[PDB]
Design a protein around this ligand. Structure first.
Ligand SMILES: O=C(O)c1cc(=O)[nH]c(=O)n1[C@@H]1O[C@H](COP(=O)(O)O)[C@@H](O)[C@H]1O
Ligand SMILES: O=C(O)c1cc(=O)[nH]c(=O)n1[C@@H]1O[C@H](COP(=O)(O)O)[C@@H](O)[C@H]1O
Ligand code: PRO
Ligand code: PRO
Lengths: 258, 258
């Protein structure tokens, strides 16, 4: 009784941000999130415009954007609205609740003003979520909890992962899902986003480990692949994005069955 | 055979940043780190100038500084040099190694250019440290690993804490110690910095829990207290800093004994 993305978008307990995401995933036949860790606004915008039709989501890295301004983010929003994708900021919110709220709302970046989605580590306990929610729930935002990590020696295993799932399911007005390597919640209202994805086997020199779209979506039951270097380092980024999109989409269809 | 801060500064395996810190702690009779989560550069600078003599370290929050510029940090460095304290940025580095290095070096904040110390969560595995080190070791910097957290529901316990200690002791060319609630390493070359500290019992509304300087330094064996609201919210911040300094310093002396 596994439901399509379009049907999950209508579930009673679905979060509005998750519903918007699931609907556009179904409409566009894409479950690909591009991770755009680029230092130049022009490259970010040119990637978002050219690859926008191929992605359901753009993971931004504003901490590395040398020429960040809030106007760059206004232009990115225009592309996200045009092409229909969500903006997910990479910043790892991972402080006590009191401090995280100011990190999310304030400073020069004003992340909550333009990010549809943010992610948090659960290591501080549920106060990290409660603090983020005091800013994000009024701003109609969603959050992902990092329940598992792709890198060698990850401590996000076992009881840590279970605590992330419990924290999500108790803050469902704000938490829309997980960064994980596999399905970790049995509740279909939650999204599963999986980084550490390439078409070819391997890793990097600093602990990254890759699995394929077919493995992560098809066998491990995740919903969305997050891909950085497998696209960003390719010569033709559009073609690369299409290969990842078609891989992740067909893996989803085949797991759904008739 | 517990050694004074000044003797620890001379240990064979001491990191140069730790040695500088330990020497100034001994010289100034201060084991207080002020956490300055303020939104205005003028307030940050006025606090750093007035409280500089009373602290061994200033924990900055540049993600919330509304009027951040690199020149503000140049002025902060001038105060840190004058009054003799280290600058410790709060940003929770907690990504895979490849991504964390750009977060530390780049963007608008260029954290590695002005921060003596940074902190990392160990949840990604040791690649987080290896990535930070590829920027910080050439820049002569130090790192603290978050081995325990002060907040309710913290998952930084048990085997997680042990993994942080192992990661520190295998990256001693760069890791100078821990954010922890107590002594977690038996090796005296490592610093222990403890947040969640107030003179009075209690907590906040978002999971923070407080213990006193006497408890954390004297009974739990930590080296340095990190204090935010207990100073920042007081009317006379200088007096408050002196009360925290005298509390933490005497607790250290009494544990050292004859
Ligand atoms: O924050 C994440 O999405 C993340 C979590 C995790 O466990 N692993 C992981 O690789 N990521 C991110 O996903 C991206 C992966 O990049 P590539 O290895 O270049 O595809 C980077 O932005 C990482 O920060
Ligand atoms: O990053 C930290 O220093 C930190 C770790 C931890 O376990 N607990 C903790 O409170 N902190 C930080 O220490 C400061 C504590 O602030 P106050 O509760 O206002 O004293 C904040 O900047 C927190 O981000
Ligand atoms: O392992 C490697 O080095 C290359 C890059 C990731 C996939 N294959
Ligand atoms: O618990 C409280 O609310 C106050 C503030 C921290 C110490 N006492």
């Amino acid at each position: 009784m596994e439901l399509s993305f379009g049907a999950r978008a209508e579930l009673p307990r679905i979060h509005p941000v998750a519903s918007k995401l699931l609907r556009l995933m179904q409409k566009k036949e894409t479950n690909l999130c591009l991770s755009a860790d680029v230092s130049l606004a022009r490259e970010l915008l040119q990637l978002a415009d050219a690859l926008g039709p191929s992605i359901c989501m753009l993971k931004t890295h504003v901490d590395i954007l040398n020429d960040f301004t809030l106007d760059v983010m206004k232009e990115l929003i225009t592309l996200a609205k045009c092409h229909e994708f969500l903006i997910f900021e990479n910043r790892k919110f991972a402080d006590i609740g009191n401090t995280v709220k100011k990190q999310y709302e304030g400073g020069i970046f004003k992340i909550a003003s333009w990010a549809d989605l943010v992610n948090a580590h659960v290591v501080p306990g549920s106060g990290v979520v409660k603090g983020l929610q005091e800013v994000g729930l009024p701003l109609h935002r969603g959050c992902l909890l990092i329940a598992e990590m792709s890198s060698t020696g990850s401590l996000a295993t076992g009881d840590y992962t279970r605590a992330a799932v419990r924290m999500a399911e108790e803050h469902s007005e704000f938490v829309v899902g997980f960064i994980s390597g596999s399905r970790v919640s049995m509740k279909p209202e939650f999204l599963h986003l999986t980084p550490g994805v390439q078409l070819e086997a391997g890793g990097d020199n600093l602990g990254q480990q890759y699995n394929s779209p077919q493995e992560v979506i098809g066998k491990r039951g995740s919903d969305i692949i997050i891909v950085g270097r497998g696209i960003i380092s390719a010569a033709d980024r559009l073609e690369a994005a299409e290969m990842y999109r078609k891989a992740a989409w067909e893996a989803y269809l085949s797991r759904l069955g008739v």
